[PDB]
Amino acid sequence: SGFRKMAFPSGKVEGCMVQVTCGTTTLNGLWLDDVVYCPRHVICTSEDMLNPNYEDLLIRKSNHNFLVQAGNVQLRVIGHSMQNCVLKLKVDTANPKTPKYKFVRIQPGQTFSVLACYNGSPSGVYQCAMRPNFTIKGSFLNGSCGSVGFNIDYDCVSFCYMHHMELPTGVHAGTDLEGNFYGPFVDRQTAQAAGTDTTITVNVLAWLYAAVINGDRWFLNRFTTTLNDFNLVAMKYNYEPLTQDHVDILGPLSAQTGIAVLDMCASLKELLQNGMNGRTILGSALLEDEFTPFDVVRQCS
Amino acid sequence: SGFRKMAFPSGKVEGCMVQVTCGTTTLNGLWLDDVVYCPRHVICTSEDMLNPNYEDLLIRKSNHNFLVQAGNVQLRVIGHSMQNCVLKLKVDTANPKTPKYKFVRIQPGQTFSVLACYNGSPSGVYQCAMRPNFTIKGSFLNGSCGSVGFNIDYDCVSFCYMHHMELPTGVHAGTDLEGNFYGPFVDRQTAQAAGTDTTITVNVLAWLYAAVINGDRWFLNRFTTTLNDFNLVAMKYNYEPLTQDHVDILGPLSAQTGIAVLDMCASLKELLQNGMNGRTILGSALLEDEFTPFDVVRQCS
């Protein structure tokens, strides 16, 4: 029993993290087989960063401009290329610790684990959700750029995120491992804003089910609502509308607890309209929305 | 910027986790050099578990009763002994992935990372505090016994916890790696209760400093209180009394923010007496007490 913010074990990713240096810019890279992946803005000076033309800047680079370090052992760069916003540096050594992996782009509301790194050295691991406005609320300091987010699925690492930047509001933006940004952001040092965020409704419901599984029941009630009538309360509290597709993935938690999804929605409706009145659910005093139905099942079953 | 529940990278510990089987009992063990550490109650049957005499039960065991598996490769047990509540199984192979390590017992209010494992296979990582009543509020299912908690300090793993049991209230109890229980618990399948818990005051203050560092300031005020006068409000809200020793370790965060500790205590006093009035601090709607001053500095500096 118990319910915690839980990350995947990070070791398979720790063995892939390297330090990539270009000029006086140093960030993290991801070493899989004989290719190192890192944010392309490593090739930028502080002056280049204000308004870079990356095709120009890369064309003016050669392999010997890129210092790669796996621990202390320097890696020799034998080629380089650009994949949208990520730089690919070919090296003369395949990473012997390369796990089975995939590059997958995730959806808003899905979660992943972040291995925060500095100078190619892993420092901490935590869980994140991709917000509906395509930012993540991470924990990142200078030098973390190049850190990756991932899920693990039967010894296969699915890389879904590489960290590129902190926005002025302190939230974080990056790309998938094909270098395609999440959200309407670009890799240049200009003040960019995210769209307005919303609460991930399906995840809050998943977490209410986790609470019931763990014996928290005070928020339950005998009522029910319709899928249509609930969405009217979602709009008012800046929650995502609920889909029959969402209900069906909540199916398993609905079965294990005996609480129909629309029954739980009436509980969420009451929680939204009345607040918690000082009580907690799974040790929290607000409605948590960064646990997916999968996260809940993985931890409660 | 940002502030997250953050664990240590788990890879150094993942390479030490094995499966230990005795009879029909299977749990996790920790393989360092040529010794495997696991909870001694692995030698118990379900009938033995109600009221075990462990010296008897171990004396009736031999090496070939203990099946150890590191992945698929079985480890041959060449000796066994008891260290209080942990069983030591000597094996014929030193773990090639053995990190630099120490066995350290922690204090109530300190934090560590938990690598939750099942059948010797790591499944998730999260952060825990040792509660003042010597339990932890973990996330653990059947088969997790033997999972370890740890901190990492310059490539040295300090093991401080091995998981032995879930109490009837759903909180978790275990030992240090010398097999000495945290708190007034024993390893037998009987209903045991923890003492009444209290809030870790120094940690709440650390977290208020983290919030200020991250730009959350609404709870601040111009007031101040005395060390003595604050403890009177601590007693009323079931908070630990504050020590000058606590203040001095909060020194660095007090300096970096310019907020004297007793100034922050007046803010905590007001938060305790008035509540949050619907507002959040670092994304939480209650006062978090599972971040130490060290945790805050590590993540904010």
Ligand SMILES: C#CCNC(=O)C[C@H](Cc1ccc(F)cc1)NC(=O)[C@@H](Cc1ccc(Cl)cc1Cl)NC(=O)[C@H](N)Cc1ccccc1C#N
């Ligand atoms: C709350 C608050 C205040 N917020 C900040 O002070 C962070 C500021 C915000 C900003 C954004 C744009 C701008 F015009 C001016 C300021 N942004 C950074 O400093 C970015 C600058 C940057 C570098 C490259 C590209 Cl492609 C894109 C960008 Cl926008 N630097 C990093 O993100 C680093 N690599 C990693 C890093 C450094 C320092 C602090 C955090 C992190 C992280 N994580």
Ligand SMILES: C#CCNC(=O)C[C@H](Cc1ccc(F)cc1)NC(=O)[C@@H](Cc1ccc(Cl)cc1Cl)NC(=O)[C@H](N)Cc1ccccc1C#N
């Ligand atoms: C909320 C709620 C309900 N709470 C429970 O149902 C857990 C129950 C509580 C209990 C405690 C004592 C008792 F008389 C009767 C019941 N306790 C377990 O089941 C313990 C039994 C046990 C095994 C050995 C020793 Cl030395 C000590 C103990 Cl008390 N089993 C584990 O802890 C397993 N290894 C790991 C495990 C199994 C199942 C569920 C969680 C976990 C964990 N983590």
Ligand SMILES: [Ca+2]
């Ligand atoms: Ca209901």
Ligand SMILES: [Ca+2]
């Ligand atoms: Ca004050």
Ligand code: NA
């Ligand atoms: Na974590």
